[PDB]
Amino acid sequence: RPESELIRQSWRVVSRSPLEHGTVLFARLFALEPSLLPLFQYNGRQFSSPEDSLSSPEFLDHIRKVMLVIDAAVTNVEDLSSLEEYLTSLGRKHRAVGVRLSSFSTVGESLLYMLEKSLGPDFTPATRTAWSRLYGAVVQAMSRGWDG
């Protein structure tokens, strides 16, 4: 595949520091959709502001979890079938915690934003398209968890 290599090569730099890069993605997410902030309840409390979430070890742990799932999508970029079941159940979990399926589009824009900022001139239109397709397929798999 051509695009599989585009994903592999562009993930290499980001994957060296997943928490740093993940923090960009979530900062961008709350700037676009602040109504997602209350969905992260740790120790029975709601974060008041987006900067509150960045001081929470549990929230930062979830950033690393998100990045590891994306790492698994890249590893299986040539055949995402083998992750379908895991992704479906991850969708069910997120539905249970209160995330609306449509919020995953904003997550996609946040991921693309983070890649654009990290890669700079190396974020070619083919690289955007490749990532849009891969994230699209991840979300399709996850969408099964919302009653099908």
For ligand HEM, the binding residues (CB under 6 A) are 36, 39-40, 62, 65-66, 69-70, 90, 93-94, 97, 99, 103, 107
DSSP state of 147: T
Looking at the Cβ atoms of 40 and 146, the one nearer to ligand [Kr] is 40
Determine how many CB atoms are found less than 10 A away from the CB of residue 109.
16
d(CA 50, CA 38): 10
d(CA 45, CA 63): 18
- Residue 108 site contact among ligand [Kr], ligand HEM, none (CB < 5 to 8 Å, cut-off depends on kind): none
The verdict on whether residue 21 carries a ligand-binding annotation is no
d(CA 96, CA 90): 10
Amino acid of residue 138: V
- Residue 62 site contact among ligand [Kr], ligand HEM, none (CB < 5 to 8 Å, cut-off depends on kind): ligand HEM
- Residue 30 site contact among ligand HEM, ligand [Kr], none (CB < 5 to 8 Å, cut-off depends on kind): ligand [Kr]
- The stretch among 24-32, 78-86, 99-107, 122-130 that binds ligand [Kr] (CB under 6 A) is 24-32
Looking at the Cβ atoms of 50 and 95, the one nearer to ligand [Kr] is 50
The verdict on whether residue 94 carries a ligand-binding annotation is yes
Nearest to 108 by CA among 3, 45, 28: 28
- Minimum gap (Å) between residue 148 Cβ and ligand [Kr]: 22
Residue whose entry in the numeric block shows the structure tokens 């539905």: 95
At what angle are helices 3-15 and 18-32 packed, to 10 degrees?
Answer: 100
Residues that bind ligand [Kr] (CB under 6 A): 26-27, 30, 50, 53-54, 70, 73, 134-135, 138
